Design a protein around this ligand. Sequence first.
Ligand SMILES: Cc1c(C(=O)C2=C(O)CCCC2=O)ccc2nc(C(F)(F)F)n(-c3ccccc3)c(=O)c12
Ligand SMILES: Cc1c(C(=O)C2=C(O)CCCC2=O)ccc2nc(C(F)(F)F)n(-c3ccccc3)c(=O)c12
Ligand SMILES: [Co+2]
Ligand SMILES: [Co+2]
Lengths: 377, 377
Amino acid sequence: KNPKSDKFKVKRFHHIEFWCGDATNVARRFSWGLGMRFSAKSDLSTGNMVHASYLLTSGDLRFLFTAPYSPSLSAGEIKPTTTASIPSFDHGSCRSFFSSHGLGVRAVAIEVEDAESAFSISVANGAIPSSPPIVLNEAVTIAEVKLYGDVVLRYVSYKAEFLPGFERVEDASSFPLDYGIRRLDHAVGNVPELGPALTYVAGFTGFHQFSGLNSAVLASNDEMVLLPINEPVHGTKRKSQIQTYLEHNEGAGLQHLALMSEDIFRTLREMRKRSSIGGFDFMPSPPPTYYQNLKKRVGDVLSDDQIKECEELGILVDRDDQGTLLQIFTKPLGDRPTIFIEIIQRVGCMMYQSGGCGGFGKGNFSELFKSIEEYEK
Amino acid sequence: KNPKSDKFKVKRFHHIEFWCGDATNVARRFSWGLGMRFSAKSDLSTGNMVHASYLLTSGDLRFLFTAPYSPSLSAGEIKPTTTASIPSFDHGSCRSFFSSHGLGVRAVAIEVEDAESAFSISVANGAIPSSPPIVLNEAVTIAEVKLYGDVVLRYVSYKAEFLPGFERVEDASSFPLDYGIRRLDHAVGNVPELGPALTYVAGFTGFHQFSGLNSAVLASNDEMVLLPINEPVHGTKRKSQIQTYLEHNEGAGLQHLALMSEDIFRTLREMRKRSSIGGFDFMPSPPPTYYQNLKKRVGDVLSDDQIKECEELGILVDRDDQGTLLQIFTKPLGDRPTIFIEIIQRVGCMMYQSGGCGGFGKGNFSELFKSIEEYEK
Ligand SMILES: Cc1c(C(=O)C2=C(O)CCCC2=O)ccc2nc(C(F)(F)F)n(-c3ccccc3)c(=O)c12
Ligand SMILES: Cc1c(C(=O)C2=C(O)CCCC2=O)ccc2nc(C(F)(F)F)n(-c3ccccc3)c(=O)c12
Ligand SMILES: [Co+2]
Ligand SMILES: [Co+2]
């Protein structure tokens, strides 16, 4: 049941922005670990005296890494005279975000038809404004409203190359890394109370509903913008990982980013080769029991050798009434046990592939738990 | 003329500590870019609720990367009950250092005979105390005094494995990277006024004197701890890079770390292969003129093929009355045009090799300048 109630025209996920202490080192680490190319920059070399911003791309996935310079470089500036390429940026906000949360996502950006009307309609419908619409070089419009915690939903609209003021990166500094990641599938928030979080976001977007936690998913009209939200379930045997998140993050924020791969086998081979030489680490692999039980539940989707390849790579598998999902989770991206990355690939729901095909893997909590018990046996 | 006037017994450089916003991402970037292994950790997994610290090693070179957790994790703690493994660490100091300077060296640590007496003698002789001697697990003593800006000189002494409370890293997360770097050769500060800086540091250590800047070098008794200091020369045609440093760094601080390689050819081959895939970038190479002129001034030290190999790798060469030095400079390590790394290898002065053999390359300012003019010709 999709009532298609978006209060404005939403296209696709556009980019994700990390607020960093040093954007150079985070961006270089992420580039090597995920196989993303350096594609654009805005920094001192492009005349930006306010912040350093570096853009990584893989397919349609766009990761932006931003950190503030010393405020003294831009002391004589005012907003009308700013050299910042992202005019919503504020030194004090960025330093306070990072001191409070550590490394994390500041902005979940979606491309819309008209960011100004998206901003107006959202605020008229209960959204808390964060940054008003601003038109950059008569070409791009950006605006921001609060999503949860200190994370903003950023609207971007183009009249007709990332953002004005960003320069394309010279091919020499731009090595064409690619491990097969192609787009952002979904972005997940952790909140203390799911109910009010859902009501707030669904209220101002018109997005419709699609051990440890309760969860629900908000989706755009074509269900290609997917925003799950989690809350903790207290008193449990094992402590809720959502609760641990809220403690170490100093409250609500983005929990994980799910990146669709065109070939999750190759992506995981390439990422695992680099885990211990600067890349990302992965969750411990499920026991062989789990892969033994895969034949019975997806043996009509995946061959034995594709199942054995899932086993070599530590991949999880879940299935809907409509599709099959292959997924794996990284360890936390930085110092705090907060944000992590999910790699996914979806099988089925051909029409193009409909969004969310196969679900989000919630069947794996019990399937992994069972298999852990069966391996102890 | 070495009067051997150290006011306490100094052994060798022990480690360099970076204060970071996210120690995980800086450490992983540095590990891949410099070929340093993860060798020790102190973080949540080892019971440290205060800071995340990760140690990289290559030969005797020790790089420590530290960042604070949320203060709320350790709210009930007091210094007598601290879970911090580095008891001089302070959340507010670390956040203020990083907000003010960005990514940079907080501590230059030297191993001494007795850090408590090193601390007492230093302060009795004009050093500004930063952190008093503290004995960790009856095994190691650490103390700190101000060096310049917000950089401390850290004394460490061992009764008889990095520091108590640090755990050795499991071999799986410890990939044995090695590009040939073996030890810290020297650590260089930038200050607004050289005279008072020298008088202060030489005053409390007893260390003796060994286009753009004025410079002098302080050295320990055996001249294996080398601490050059630079000041800007104003009014020049080209703007002093020392002055640019002080502007972007918000004042005095560590300018560069020189890392001795046992084979600077292999080190530079390995680092340059990784520059655009997460590693470090290097200064633009000198023109072929410069390598043409190398035959006349070091043609008795290096073969034509070793000179042509310097040319392939962009290496600089200078020579003393006693030795020959091969060196190269990275671009800045992070967002700000402040700290960078030098790779060096020294030829000559065999007795072991005496410290500082060949000097520090000051002859290259004019030699590079000349060669740039000759290449335009
Ligand atoms: C986050 C996530 C997801 C999933 O992506 C996420 C969706 O996007 C939105 C719905 C709720 C949420 O769950 C799905 C299955 C998962 N399954 C497990 C597992 F228990 F099966 F391994 N874990 C897990 C891994 C390590 C430690 C603790 C839990 C997950 O974190 C996990
Ligand atoms: C730092 C350094 C050193 C050297 O290590 C450093 C010593 O440890 C202590 C003495 C003073 C100081 O100078 C030596 C030669 C250098 N020579 C040049 C060069 F001009 F020849 F390339 N540059 C340079 C490179 C790029 C832009 C501007 C200057 C240097 O930064 C440079
Ligand atoms: Co997910
Ligand atoms: Co030097």
